Design an enzyme around this catalytic site. Sequence first.
Site, PDB file in Angstrom:
ATOM      1  N   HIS A   1      -2.146  -3.307 -38.195  1.00  0.00           N
ATOM      2  CA  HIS A   1      -3.048  -3.566 -39.365  1.00  0.00           C
ATOM      3  C   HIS A   1      -3.370  -5.063 -39.564  1.00  0.00           C
ATOM      4  CE1 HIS A   1       0.888  -3.573 -41.689  1.00  0.00           C
ATOM      5  NE2 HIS A   1       0.268  -4.556 -42.329  1.00  0.00           N
TER       6      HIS A   1
ATOM      7  N   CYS B   1       5.297  -7.979 -44.129  1.00  0.00           N
ATOM      8  CA  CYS B   1       4.853  -7.283 -42.893  1.00  0.00           C
ATOM      9  C   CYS B   1       4.989  -8.226 -41.682  1.00  0.00           C
ATOM     10  CB  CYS B   1       3.466  -6.651 -43.007  1.00  0.00           C
ATOM     11  SG  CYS B   1       3.446  -5.236 -44.170  1.00  0.00           S
TER      12      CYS B   1
END
Length: 181
Positions: free
Chosen positions: A41, A148
């Site tokens: 992502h 992340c």
Amino acid sequence: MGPGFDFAQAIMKKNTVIARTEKGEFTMLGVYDRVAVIPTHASVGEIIYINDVETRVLDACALRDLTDTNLEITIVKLDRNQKFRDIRHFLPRCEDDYNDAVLSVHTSKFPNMYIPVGQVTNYGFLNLGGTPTHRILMYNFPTRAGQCGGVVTTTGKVIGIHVGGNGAQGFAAMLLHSYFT
């Protein structure tokens, strides 16, 4: 403060860079040579910033399992003038569950951050932001936006990268030795 944090620090101090895409700043784990990993992502393009330096991307591959299911790992080869220490011998060969993990993050926002997340479950399938995803690890820690790409380690093993959470639990994509032969 102890042996889990000591292994995590040894990985962060030599095998991470700060990666910036149009989707924000990520912890990025260097694995060997000019080869690194980042969550898919992050949307890696032709150019990426690495420690705030404009860098050409020589190759990028979003991994999927043999069922054509998302694994949420992108392997990136960077046009950089320096190799990473080779840490492939710290990667597990098989899917597994683990005790006593640390999640370690290094960005502008969260420098030198180490989280004792505790037990790690081989969760398997997760609907991650609407995308069916396999080979997920789960830990019971309320992880946040900005973590992340964080590296998940046990004493002696580099086992995953942080890819999301639900407010109570965090989720990592497994790293396996066979991804980097």
